[PDB]
From a paper:
The signals are triggered by lymphocyte surface receptors and further transduced by a multitude of effectors that converge on the CBM, which is a macromolecule complex that consists of caspase recruitment domain membrane-associated guanylate kinase protein 1 (CARMA1), B-cell lymphoma 10 (BCL10) and mucosa-associated lymphoid tissue lymphoma translocation gene 1 (MALT1). The CBM complex plays a specific and essential role in the activation of nuclear factor-κB (NF-κB) and c-Jun N-terminal kinase (JNK). As a scaffold molecule, CARMA1 recruits BCL10, MALT1, protein kinase C and TRAF6 to form a multiprotein complex. The CARD domain is located at the amino terminus of CARMA1 and is able to associate with BCL10, the key first step in CBM formation after stimulation.
The crystal structure of CARMA1-CARD was determined at a resolution of 1.75 Å using single-wavelength anomalous dispersion (SAD). There is one molecule per asymmetric unit. The structure of CARMA1-CARD contains residues 19–109. Each molecule contains six α-helices, and they are compactly arranged around a conserved hydrophobic core, which is the characteristic fold in the death domain superfamily. Helices H2 to H5 are arranged in an anti-parallel helix bundle, whereas H1 and H6 flank one side of the bundle and cover the top region of helices H4 and H5. Of the six helices, H1 is the longest and is slightly bent at residue N29, thereby separating the helix into two smaller α-helices, which is similar to the CARD domains from Apaf-1 and NOD1. The significant difference exists in the loop between helices H3 and H4, which is longer and more flexible in CARMA1-CARD. An area of clustered positive charges was found on the surface of CARMA1-CARD. The positive patch was formed by residues R35, K41, K69 and R72. In the crystal structure of CARMA1-CARD, this positive patch is stabilized by two sulfate ions through multiple hydrogen bonds.
Author numbering: 20 to 109
Write the structure that this text describes.
Amino acid sequence: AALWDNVECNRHMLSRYINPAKLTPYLRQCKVIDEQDEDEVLNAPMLPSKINRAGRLLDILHTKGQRGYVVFLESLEFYYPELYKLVTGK
């Protein structure tokens, strides 16, 4: 609830700048989302606005407990270093 605050207060940058497809293979491999979660994220319409493109992914991760939080953070550390620093305040 408070741990997730780090993601939620940065949800705007995360929702725009994450390309979900880059993250899902690692998230799935770590078992924090499944094939169907990935489907929902990958099959979502490609809109003119990218502002909410990773919105669905975040909302799914929000339901995945501290494991989800920690694995998501490492996925940012791997793939989106500036976003990782944003979330962790470093």
